[PDB]
């Protein structure tokens, strides 16, 4: 742990970055068989706001 740095701000930035990478797994289908891929549903309109990106 180096000396004479802004431990607080750096910890908050690394906290938001680590929580972003941890939350957003960004899973996506890579291989398919019968040429059937995951097609997401866009008809979800209940307004699921206040959720992380």
């Amino acid at each position, epitope marked *: 742990q180096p000396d004479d740095i802004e431990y607080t701000s750096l910890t908050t930035a690394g906290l938001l970055y680590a929580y972003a990478v941890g939350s957003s797994a960004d899973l996506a289908q890579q291989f398919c068989v019968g040429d059937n891929k995951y097609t997401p549903d866009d008809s979800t309109g209940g*307004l699921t706001t206040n*959720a992380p990106p």
Partner: nanobody
Amino acid sequence: QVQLVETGGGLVQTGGSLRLSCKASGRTFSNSIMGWFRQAPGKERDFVAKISWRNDYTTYADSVKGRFTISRDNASNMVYLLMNNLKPEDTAVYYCAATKAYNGGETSGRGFYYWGQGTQVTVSS
């Protein structure tokens, strides 16, 4: 990619009305501000109306207040601009804009990462 499609423009007389529809696809706009801009050839691209994701808060330009009515349906992934009581000054190319998530949509064009090719709206006498 995410794209915005504008339909419903055309040439009308002064006092008529048009209904612009915008289909936003490619991602989720649950926390995204939708909006409309316009551009007259030889003039600056300007702001007409925007609607946020928070309580559908509507912001209008003074040039269209009382005449235009912007709305959005998230289950339909669409945003409409209702153009009542048209004027020749409202002749322009109208573009659909959608800012990124949790980001502001300013009048200058700040934010508003996505844009559409636009639809023509001409108003004559």
